[PDB]
Every structure is written in C-alpha cells, then in structure tokens.
Amino acid sequence: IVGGYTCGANTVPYQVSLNSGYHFCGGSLINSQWVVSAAHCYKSGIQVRLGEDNINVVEGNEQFISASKSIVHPSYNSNTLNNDIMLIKLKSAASLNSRVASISLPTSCASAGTQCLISGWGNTKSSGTSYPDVLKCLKAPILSDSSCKSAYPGQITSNMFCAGYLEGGKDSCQGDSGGPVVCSGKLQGIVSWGSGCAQKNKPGVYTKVCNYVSWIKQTIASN
Numbered sequence: 001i002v003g004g005y006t007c008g009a010n011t012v013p014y015q016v017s018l019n020s021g022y023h024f025c026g027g028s029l030i031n032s033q034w035v036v037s038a039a040h041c042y043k044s045g046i047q048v049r050l051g052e053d054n055i056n057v058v059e060g061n062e063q064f065i066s067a068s069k070s071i072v073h074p075s076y077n078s079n080t081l082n083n084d085i086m087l088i089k090l091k092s093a094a095s096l097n098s099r100v101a102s103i104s105l106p107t108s109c110a111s112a113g114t115q116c117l118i119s120g121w122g123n124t125k126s127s128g129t130s131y132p133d134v135l136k137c138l139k140a141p142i143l144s145d146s147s148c149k150s151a152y153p154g155q156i157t158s159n160m161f162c163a164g165y166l167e168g169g170k171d172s173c174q175g176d177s178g179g180p181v182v183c184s185g186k187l188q189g190i191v192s193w194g195s196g197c198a199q200k201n202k203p204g205v206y207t208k209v210c211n212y213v214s215w216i217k218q219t220i221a222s223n
C-alpha cells in the first residue's frame with residue numbers, strides 16, 4: 001500500500017497472509033474454513049496465516065493453518081487477468097473471535113463513489129522498494145467505469161473495477177494482491193493489478209466480487 005496508514009493490530013480481522021516460506025499475497029476469510037484470494041496468487045504449498053499484524057514477529061493472536069484444496073476460477077485468463085479469483089479451503093476450521101473474523105459477501109454490487117478500505121503488506125513505495133512488516137490500510141473510492149476504461153483502454157472487463165485516485169500518490173501495490181477491498185462492511189473487491197503503483201492516471205484494478213457470489217456459494221457447498 002502506497003500512501004496509506006498503519007491499520008493497527010487486528011483492526012482488519014478478515015485479512016489473511018498467504019505464506020509459502022514468506023508472505024506472497026493477501027486474502028480474505030469468508031467463513032471459518034474458506035479464504036478468497038486472486039487466481040494469480042496460485043501456488044502449491046500454501047499456509048494461511050490469520051490474526052497477523054507484524055508478519056515477522058509472533059505476537060499472540062495468530063492462527064497458522066495449511067490449505068487442503070485450492071480452486072482457481074474456471075475461466076481465469078492469466079494474460080488479461082479476467083476472472084482473477086481463487087478459493088482456498090483450510091485443513092481445519094479457524095477459531096473465530098473479535099480479532100479473527102469473516103467478512104460478508106455482498107448481496108449487491110457497489111456503485112462508483114462508494115468509499116472502501118484496502119489493506120495489505122505490499123510495497124509502500126511507487127519508486128523503489130520498502131516492504132512493511134505491519135498491516136497498512138488505505139481508504140479509497142470506487143471510480144466510474146468510464147474513468148477506469150479511459151485510464152486502461154482495451155483492458156477493463158465487466159469483472160473489474162478501478163478504485164483510488166487519478167492524481168496518484170495512494171494505491172495498492174506489489175504484495176497486496178489477493179487482499180480485500182471492503183465497502184460498507186462487505187467484500188466488494190480483490191486486489192488484482194495495475195500499471196505500477198500510485199502513478200497519475202493509473203489507479204488500481206480490482207476483481208469485482210459481486211459477479212462471483214453464486215460461484216463462491218456453490219463451490220463451498222460441494223467441496
């Protein structure tokens with residue numbers, strides 16, 4: 001996250017870190033046994049880390065649970081990043097409390113102008129590299145589809161939205177991918193892609209979760 005603020009420990013209780021020896025992507029806890037992330041974060045050998053603030057220090061609220069199954073969306077396209085969404089089943093259910101909690105799926109899609117919260121452990125610089133150890137947060141609005149398509153001609157599908165600031169300076173970045181975009185208490189987006197981070201006229205692009213609720217629910221019900 002570039003241009004954000006330190007969230008505070010366990011203030012984003014649905015945020016997960018995906019770990020394969022190191023943090024590589026975020027995700028969101030949607031019930032006691034399932035996480036949603038970005039398909040481009042797929043790899044074998046995932047450990048899901050819940051209850052994290054500092055990802056390099058054991059602070060006492062963590063739960064570390066291995067994945068038993070990963071399911072990339074049937075229509076994910078790695079070249080265009082269309083349908084950039086993946087479900088991960090945990091080997092055992094997490095223990096839910098005030099510091100480790102699920103986030104609700106949306107019943108309706110959010111409109112442009114709605115303010116959302118984006119969070120992650122990704123790079124905090126638009127030029128160069130500095131990775132934080134504690135969770136960072138950013139408040140940002142959903143942009144109109146017309147502004148999004150004007151920023152990224154030929155690249156925005158109906159399964160994507162832009163959020164952020166056309167002036168630049170505040171955005172998600174590398175290492176935030178897979179993490180949550182929460183608006184009015186519901187999961188509306190997944191951190192997916194952008195051109196650099198925090199550049200003028202290049203806001204972040206997010207997977208539009210409301211288009212996937214039926215797939216999510218049916219997949220969980222049968223796996």
Ligand SMILES: [Ca+2]
Pocket residue numbers: 052053054055056057058059062
């Ligand atoms: Ca920790």
